Design an enzyme around this catalytic site. Sequence first.
Site, short mmCIF file in Angstrom:
data_model
loop_
_atom_site.label_atom_id
_atom_site.label_comp_id
_atom_site.label_asym_id
_atom_site.label_seq_id
_atom_site.Cartn_x
_atom_site.Cartn_y
_atom_site.Cartn_z
N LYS A 169 0.82 -1.20 0.00
CA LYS A 169 0.00 0.00 0.00
C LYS A 169 0.86 1.26 0.00
O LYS A 169 0.58 2.21 -0.73
CB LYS A 169 -0.93 -0.01 1.21
CG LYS A 169 -2.13 -0.93 1.11
CD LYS A 169 -2.61 -1.33 2.50
CE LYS A 169 -4.03 -1.84 2.50
NZ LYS A 169 -4.38 -2.39 3.84
N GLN A 200 -3.98 -1.36 11.86
CA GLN A 200 -3.85 -2.72 11.36
C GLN A 200 -4.23 -3.72 12.44
O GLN A 200 -3.75 -3.65 13.57
CB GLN A 200 -2.43 -2.97 10.87
CG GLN A 200 -2.13 -2.34 9.51
CD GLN A 200 -3.07 -2.82 8.41
OE1 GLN A 200 -2.87 -3.89 7.83
NE2 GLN A 200 -4.11 -2.03 8.13
N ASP A 206 -10.64 3.88 5.57
CA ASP A 206 -11.11 2.53 5.31
C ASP A 206 -12.63 2.48 5.14
O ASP A 206 -13.15 1.57 4.49
CB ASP A 206 -10.68 1.59 6.44
CG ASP A 206 -10.41 0.18 5.97
OD1 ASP A 206 -10.19 -0.03 4.76
OD2 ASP A 206 -10.40 -0.73 6.82
C1 LIG Z 1 -3.78 -5.37 -5.47
O1 LIG Z 1 -4.57 -6.45 -5.00
C2 LIG Z 1 -3.92 -7.69 -4.82
C3 LIG Z 1 -4.70 -8.79 -5.56
C4 LIG Z 1 -4.79 -8.48 -7.04
O2 LIG Z 1 -3.80 -7.95 -7.58
O3 LIG Z 1 -5.88 -8.76 -7.61
C5 LIG Z 1 -3.89 -7.86 -3.28
C6 LIG Z 1 -3.44 -9.26 -2.92
C7 LIG Z 1 -2.98 -6.83 -2.63
O4 LIG Z 1 -1.76 -6.94 -2.69
C8 LIG Z 1 -3.53 -5.61 -1.87
C9 LIG Z 1 -2.45 -4.60 -1.50
C10 LIG Z 1 -4.26 -6.10 -0.66
C11 LIG Z 1 -5.57 -6.23 -0.45
C12 LIG Z 1 -6.53 -5.83 -1.52
C13 LIG Z 1 -6.19 -6.76 0.84
O5 LIG Z 1 -7.04 -5.73 1.33
C14 LIG Z 1 -6.51 -4.82 2.18
O6 LIG Z 1 -5.31 -4.72 2.33
C15 LIG Z 1 -7.54 -3.97 2.92
O7 LIG Z 1 -6.93 -2.70 2.87
C16 LIG Z 1 -7.59 -4.40 4.46
O8 LIG Z 1 -6.48 -3.86 5.09
C17 LIG Z 1 -7.66 -5.89 4.71
C18 LIG Z 1 -8.72 -6.69 4.66
C19 LIG Z 1 -8.81 -8.18 4.90
C20 LIG Z 1 -9.25 -8.45 6.34
C21 LIG Z 1 -7.52 -8.96 4.50
C22 LIG Z 1 -6.82 -8.53 3.19
C23 LIG Z 1 -7.80 -8.37 2.00
C24 LIG Z 1 -7.11 -8.00 0.66
C25 LIG Z 1 -6.28 -9.17 0.19
#
Ligand SMILES: CO[C@H](CC(=O)O)[C@@H](C)C(=O)[C@H](C)/C=C(\C)[C@H]1OC(=O)[C@H](O)[C@H](O)/C=C/[C@H](C)CCC[C@@H]1C
Lengths: 280, 280
Positions: free
Chosen positions: A50, A94, A117
Amino acid sequence: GAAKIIDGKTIAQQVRSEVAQKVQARIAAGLRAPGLAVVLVGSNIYVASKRKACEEVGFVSRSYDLPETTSEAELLELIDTLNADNTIDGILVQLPLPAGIDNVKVLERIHPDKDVDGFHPYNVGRLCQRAPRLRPCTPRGIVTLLERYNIDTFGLNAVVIGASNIVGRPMSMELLLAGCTTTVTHRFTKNLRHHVENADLLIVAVGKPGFIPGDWIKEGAIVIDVGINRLENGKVVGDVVFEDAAKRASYITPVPGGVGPMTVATLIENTLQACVEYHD
Amino acid sequence: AAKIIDGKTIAQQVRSEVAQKVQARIAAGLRAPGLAVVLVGSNYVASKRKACEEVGFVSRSYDLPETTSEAELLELIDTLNADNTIDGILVQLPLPAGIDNVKVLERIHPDKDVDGFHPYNVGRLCQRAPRLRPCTPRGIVTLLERYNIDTFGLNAVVIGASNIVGRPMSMELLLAGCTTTVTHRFTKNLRHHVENADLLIVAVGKPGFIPGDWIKEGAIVIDVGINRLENGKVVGDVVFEDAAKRASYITPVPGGVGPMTVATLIENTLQACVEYHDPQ
Ligand SMILES: CO[C@H](CC(=O)O)[C@@H](C)C(=O)[C@H](C)/C=C(\C)[C@H]1OC(=O)[C@H](O)[C@H](O)/C=C/[C@H](C)CCC[C@@H]1C
Ligand SMILES: CO[C@H](CC(=O)O)[C@@H](C)C(=O)[C@H](C)/C=C(\C)[C@H]1OC(=O)[C@H](O)[C@H](O)/C=C/[C@H](C)CCC[C@@H]1C
């Protein structure tokens, strides 16, 4: 059939570029860059990944690393300080937090104007009452996808699979705001297939790889796959059997490369919104 | 023929139960719950106050002139928020045109929002963690409970998506385990939804909107309409005689949901007192 791709990775990049343009315009006007604060308690990728996106758009981010011994009172005092810091537009806490700390009390202490969020009950309640402020990131990113692909939502029979606080429940309030008929299904639903088969718009958020077979999908349906299921080989798949659903859907989000990037892009949009509308 | 969901009778039992809980508080030496009502200008208040006197509550009415400024009104809410003898605060609408409705209603502390429409309270219900809940949807859940209607697994259809009923109704139903469909003005082919509904909640404010022969055989019909007709009668959104030939249970109008709305306001005021302000 060959459904069109809903290329969330490309849309997210367009959204981040738009934000970066507005940030560069603020700097040129003598205004500060938006500021994000991340709070980490103890120890346990996504946060790292992020911060890269925040770097790209010109945000400043700061990360607090508190020891595991941190008390609930100390943590609540920190949120108070960040709430009062005019250089901070968004606060992220977090999870998980150390045991003995009330997660709810800590997260609700964030002022809703810095809850980028979008899961403070005040923000959720505002969206429900048709007067949204900062919106839940994942459901808002999905609505953005529909808009960017020029999908008219009014009168669509939408079905949400899963009723989680993080997706399913706020998703139904976003979809109602967008004029969809909304059905929310969950573990007590009997004949899930009957609901899915009549969906013009299917939002799948159960966190189970390949749970929805392509057979169930209405011909012409729009399929949104919120699943991000880590397989043992390290790769990621969605809740929908892509190859089979793409035979029937009109549009379909791949995984990876669909909703995921939009969740991050919406967090970024929310932070700029907090900065521009609520703090400057 | 359908059985009657006798909301008038249920409401009286709920009120009697609150009244006896107040009796027990008095015997133990504790204060009665207290409700404050704020009116600005002139324009159901007498009936709700009536019901508060019936159950032994303290009631307090502020009748302020139309000259009241927004600052004075906000100061009054602050005073009431801090008054330990007040458990519930109601502000009557409409307010004078020069005053911001939203800022005044959101100034009420959520644990005194016995009407249940502060966005924090709506958001908490959306998140499966309800505090004080919107009165009409919660009264409808109580009706189903008191008639021993198992809600888990039912296909529930809400007709209308109003902030006051339809939208929060869907979150109460999800919490009760129903598969929940919210329909509204843009819904295509309402009959298809109504025909599949084991539980039908109609809340549009239009007499006869749903024809009775659409009702699923054995459905539970909850009529939230209160429509005053030309001939002086009060009728619901559903033609009773036609719906009663098919439903297993049906609320009449009057005497169904209306009394439960008032009783739930009473119940919410006791709840605020017992759980949030003066617990034991
Ligand atoms: C870019 O998306 C990747 C996929 C793909 O490329 O399709 C993807 C893998 C990625 O690395 C990103 C950074 C991360 C997210 C989207 C995660 O969500 C969060 O972090 C939310 O902000 C929040 O903090 C967390 C929520 C849930 C309880 C657990 C996390 C859910 C989710 C995977
Ligand atoms: C006892 O119920 C009567 C029927 C019947 O007997 O079946 C019923 C006629 C009755 O007198 C009571 C006091 C009143 C209510 C239920 C009104 O709702 C509110 O006041 C709620 O507090 C809230 O203020 C709602 C406001 C709406 C925007 C407009 C009011 C709608 C509704 C009639």
